[PDB]
Design a binder for this molecule. Sequence first.
Ligand SMILES: [Ca+2]
Length: 231
Amino acid sequence: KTNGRNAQIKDTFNQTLKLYPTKNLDDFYDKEGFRDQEFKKGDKGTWIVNSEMVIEPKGKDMETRGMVLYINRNTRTTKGYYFISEMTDDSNGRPKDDEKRYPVKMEHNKIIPTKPLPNDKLKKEIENFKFFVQYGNFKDINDYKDGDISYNPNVPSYSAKYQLNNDDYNVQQLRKRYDIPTKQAPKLLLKGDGDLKGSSVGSRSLEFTFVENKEENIYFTDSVQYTPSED
Ligand SMILES: [Ca+2]
């Protein structure tokens, strides 16, 4: 059904999905996204890339691992960090939570820690890291069936939700790169806000939701966004 802004919503999301894959992160130095007057004249923009695997099983410790990189096209340098967040409850129900960040830089499509690590295995996990934009690959948005499109014109914000099967290319890639403890086929959720044609201030992201209830949350989030740079 093409009511309201459903077609415009699908169109903007297809523009996000078109970026999958971009195997060489250096390519971002030469990609120009959408520009407004939030970019100061001489600023060429920064590409922020972020992938995170959230695994919070029922009745168990919670853990998230991911990375963020800031690809600055002005300086042609890229810095960010890998992180491991852990949230646990001691026997009295008291939180014992932490998050550790390991600074890194990107050079010649390689991930290089800028501080040493506590062990070799973690060093390799950081060096071998691949953002979802480096191996994801979607079909045209319109090829995904029975989409649930939502639109709040006041923000404005929007979303498109689809049920995927376990034979989906992307799902198979996630199960190979991560130890996801759930047989369930995930939903793909596209989210956006700000002008439908695009904006600097606005956001675009995606998620693969394997489980979502009050006791358990297992999901994967990814975003690739063109933003004004820091001065
Ligand atoms: Ca935007």
